[PDB]
Amino acid sequence: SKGFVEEMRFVAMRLHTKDQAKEGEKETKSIEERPVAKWEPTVEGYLRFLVDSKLVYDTLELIIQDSNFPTYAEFKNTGLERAEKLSTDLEWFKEQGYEIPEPTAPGKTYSQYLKELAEKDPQAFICHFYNIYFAHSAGGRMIGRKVAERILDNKELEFYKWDGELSQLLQNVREKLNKVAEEWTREEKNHCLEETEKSFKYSGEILRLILS
Ligand code: HEM
């Protein structure tokens, strides 16, 4: 009742583990659901995660920049875009001497699924849009810090930097999400919310690469 973004957040928080957040109701079943403080990332797995994340963000950001669909065009130039930052960070790993892997199935499958939804199901597409970006600025930063401390000697990658002030950029996007949702039917809103589990499933398989 605080606007549709609060409904999306309520549904998403319920899908965390208690090992992740106060409101979480999921059991800790997989290795990527362990408390971040207990994670043991490797640079090799982290690179696979960054490459597979880059494909997903490339897909999201290209869909939005090239679209004339007013729902999608509302989210051009949010300040949250990550594709170029990830390119810079993949460049930094190359100069440190690491070889950059090719995108694997978790990134390819998610990127492919997002294109299909962008063409056919805007309500579902928006749900993934919200969960991918707003996860990254929430638990994603906790993961990035833990990875930086343990294996990167506190390098702060561009992936975890924003050109404006993060909290205002997020609230601007929240307002735009509420704006597009007010032109949806209640069922369409409901379809968006029911999509959240799929977003955790696809994102969860990418996060797992950090630990593989
Ligand atoms: C290791 C994995 C994860 C951890 C440790 C984590 C942790 C957190 C934490 C601590 C918060 C903030 C809770 C609060 O301040 O009340 C949060 C918010 C959130 N998380 Fe996660 N999370 C993880 C994975 C995910 C995934 C896979 C998704 C979705 C694909 C997701 C979606 C969200 C969303 C949408 C929010 C709301 C952020 C906002 O309101 O701006 N999280 N998460």
Numbering used by the authors: 71 to 282
Paper lines:
Arabidopsis thaliana heme oxygenase‐1 (AtHO‐1), a metabolic enzyme in the heme degradation pathway, serves as a prototype for study of the bilin‐related functions in plants. Past biological analyses revealed that AtHO‐1 requires ferredoxin‐NADP+ reductase (FNR) and ferredoxin for its enzymatic activity.
Furthermore, we reported the crystal structure of heme‐bound AtHO‐1, which demonstrates both conserved and previously undescribed features of plant heme oxygenases. Here, we characterized the binding and degradation of heme by AtHO‐1, and found that ferredoxin is a dispensable component of the reducing system that provides electrons for heme oxidation. Finally, the electron transfer pathway from FNR to AtHO‐1 is suggested based on the known structural information.
